[PDB]
Amino acid sequence: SGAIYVGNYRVVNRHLATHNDWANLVWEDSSRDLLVSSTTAQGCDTIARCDCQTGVYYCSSRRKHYPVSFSKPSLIFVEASEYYPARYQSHLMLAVGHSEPGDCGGILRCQHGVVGIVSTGGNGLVGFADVRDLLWLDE
């Protein structure tokens, strides 16, 4: 569990979206595991507009923040699950670090702000769904 709150938007993992998220839907992408829904309250999360590859992510399974080196956003194969079949997830960054199933939604941050949220993991790795290309979140 975890979300990004920027202005009049709420960015969540598409597989964890609730009924209100789909009733106030702005944009969703199964291949990115993202869903953005509208909000009545004014959010203040600063989105990073950068090309960073180092930052800090929040790990609910260890109740700790961790500094990571991560890859540039790309098409990475993800095994089938109870939310999606076997596909290539796009805009996904990988890093060496602890992650377990309840960790989806933990924020990844750099000096410039929010980079993305935990989406995949396993075998001593962590995957983040990037949000830095979505310039409409700010405008």
Give the residue numbers marked as catalytic. 15, 33, 104
Site for ligand A1B14 in 30-59 (CB under 6 A): 33
* Residue number, 35 or 92, with CB nearest to Zn ion: 92
Q: How many CA atoms lie within 13 A of 16 on its CB side?
A: 17
One-letter amino acid identity for 102? Answer: G
| Site map (CB under 6 A) of ligand A1B14, residues 92-111, x = contact | -------xxx-xx-------
Task: Pick what 136 binds: Zn ion, ligand A1B14, none; C-beta below 5 to 8 Å, kind-dependent.
Answer: none
Segments in 12-137 forming alpha helices (H): 19-23
Judged by CB under 6 A, the number of residues near ligand A1B14 is: 17
Tokens of 122: 């396993």
CB of 95 closer than 8 Å to CB of 70 = yes
Determine if 89 is a binding residue for ligand A1B14 (CB under 6 A).
yes
Residues forming contacts to Zn ion in the complex (CB under 5 A) are 48, 50, 52, 110, 112
Local structure of 33: helix, strand or coil: coil
Q: Which stretch binds ligand A1B14 (CB under 6 A): 4-12, 17-25, 39-47, 82-90?
A: 82-90
Query: How many other C-beta atoms lie within 10 A of the C-beta of residue 93?
Result: 23
Of 97, 85, 6, 15, residue with least CA distance to 56: 97
Binding site for ligand A1B14 (CB under 6 A): 15, 33, 78, 81, 83-84, 89, 99-101, 103-104, 118-122
